[PDB]
């Protein structure tokens, strides 16, 4: 029998059937999409979408035992790098209609190609912008509860801090997925992560740091709070 139970984190579920067990999922905000290749489980009249850790760094973090997950129902999220993977759809499922997600990408082409994935998920607002210059989209993005960032750039920690200074509420959280080689290919990943932690700690309280292996190689997710 198929059993869908509530995960520790609200909006997240643990699906345990006969074959696909030890798998997490979110409740589809827009059931009936019938998107080519969708992996959905119908349970008690509702659709649950399998969260693929190979296609979502947040899914990987949760499966790796993430303890702090600030993205919850009703929260507002500034999402830098919204087009990568399947993460946006799951964050949309979790936040629900009472919340909102402002997604930033620098390429108009990337945003245009993102249309078919978010067109029905009206709680996602795609916005063109350069994440290194947060001030440029201040008229569109409000103060938010959480900033989630997946930007493989050398200055990604500074990007988080600068965006937090403009948009993050006091007490709000930041979540950043860091690819060590996007910062320094000449240093050991653990050293890069330690340096990133030092940089973030000057502005935030660093709450948690978790490696994403085996789903990603030399990537770590940091959860921080704007004290």
UniProtKB/Swiss-Prot annotation:
EC number: 2.1.1.-
UniProt binding sites for S-adenosyl-L-methionine: 86-87, 105-106, 130-131, 150-153
Pfam families: Fibrillarin
GO MF assignments: histone H2AQ104 methyltransferase activity; RNA binding; rRNA methyltransferase activity
Any Gene Ontology biological process: box C/D sno(s)RNA 3'-end processing
Signal sequence, renumbered to the chain: none
Keywords: Methyltransferase, RNA-binding, rRNA processing, Transferase, tRNA processing
Residues passing through the membrane, by range: none
Domain of life the protein comes from: Archaea
Assembly mode: Interacts with nop5. Component of box C/D small ribonucleoprotein (sRNP) particles that contain rpl7ae, FlpA and nop5, plus a guide RNA.
Family: Belongs to the methyltransferase superfamily. Fibrillarin family.
Protein purpose: Involved in pre-rRNA and tRNA processing. Utilizes the methyl donor S-adenosyl-L-methionine to catalyze the site-specific 2'-hydroxyl methylation of ribose moieties in rRNA and tRNA. Site specificity is provided by a guide RNA that base pairs with the substrate. Methylation occurs at a characteristic distance from the sequence involved in base pairing with the guide RNA.
Stored NCBIfam families: PRK04266.1-2, PRK04266.1-3
HAMAP family registered for this protein in UniProt: RNA_methyltransf_FlpA
Protein name: Fibrillarin-like rRNA/tRNA 2'-O-methyltransferase
Species: Pyrococcus horikoshii (strain ATCC 700860 / DSM 12428 / JCM 9974 / NBRC 100139 / OT-3)
């Amino acid at each position: 029998m198929v059993e869908v139970k509530k995960h520790k984190f609200p909006g997240v579920y643990t699906v345990i059937d006969d074959d696909g067990s030890e798998r997490i999922a979110t409740k589809n905000l827009v059931p009936g999409q019938r998107v080519y290749g969708e992996r959905v489980i119908k349970w008690e009249g509702e659709e649950y979408r399998i969260w693929n850790p190979n296609r979502s760094k947040l899914g990987a973090a949760i499966m790796n035992g993430l303890k702090n997950f600030p993205i919850k129902p009703g929260k507002s999220v500034l999402y830098l790098g919204i087009a990568s993977g399947t993460t946006a759809s799951h964050v949309s499922d979790i936040v629900g209609w009472e919340g909102k997600i402002f997604g930033i990408e620098f390429s108009p082409r990337v945003l245009r190609e993102l249309v078919p994935i978010v067109e029905e998920r009206r709680n996602i607002v795609p916005i063109l912008g350069d994440a290194t210059k947060p001030e440029e989209y201040r008229a569109l993005v409000p103060k938010v509860d959480v900033i989630f960032e997946d930007v493989a750039q050398p200055t990604q920690a500074k990007i988080l801090i600068d965006n937090a200074e403009v948009y993050l509420k006091r007490g709000g959280y930041g979540m950043i997925a860091v690819k060590s080689r996007s910062i320094d290919v000449t240093k050991e990943p653990e050293q890069v992560f330690r340096e990133v932690e030092r940089e973030l700690s000057e502005y935030f309280e660093v709450i948690e740091r978790l490696n994403l292996e085996p789903y990603e190689k030399d990537h770590a997710l940091f959860v921080v709070r704007k004290t």
